[PDB]
Amino acid sequence: GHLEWQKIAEELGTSRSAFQCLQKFQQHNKALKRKEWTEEEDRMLTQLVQEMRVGSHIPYRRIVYYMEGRD
DNA sequence: CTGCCGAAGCGAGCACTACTGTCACACCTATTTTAAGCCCTTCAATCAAATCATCTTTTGGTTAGGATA
């Protein structure tokens, strides 16, 4: 279930640890790197942009702290 | 017309280190020779702290490997 990555590393059998396995998976996890879009992400992105943006300047990536699976 | 002697307030003795006239002998330095240790300067050889140049780790945006909504 993408959980207990110590067990995942042990099952891998190449002497990897949980942290390395998780790092590699997250760097190649479609669920994390959101090529997709969701309604709540769009709504909250619009809300934060409208709250903060002045003129043509918006906090393009500082919104990522609030919305998951982004950069 | 001059002169004696009282009343009250004072007082005593007991309770089983600054100068000056001399004076000779100290102070003082003329140099020799070591043997290991001296203080300060003064520059030179070596060092290490800080700064610059460039490779690289990651933080916002564009590209065409890559994808949903």
Q: Separation of CA A58 and C1' B6 in angstroms? A: 132
d(CA A15, CA A3): 18
Residue A20 backbone phi and psi in degrees, to 5: -65, -45
Cβ contacts of A20 within 8 Å, gap of 6 or more? A9
Burial of A45 per CB tally in 10 Å (0-12, 13-18, 19+)? middle
Calculate the alpha carbon distances from A31 to A13, A14, A27, A47 in Å.
25, 25, 10, 24
Rounded CA–C1' distance between A9 and B54, in angstroms: 39
- Protein-strand B interface by C-beta, 7 A: A 35-38, 60-62, 71
Resolution at which this structure was determined, Å: 3.3
Structure determined by: cryo-EM
The nucleotide minimizing the C1' distance to residue A60's CA is B60
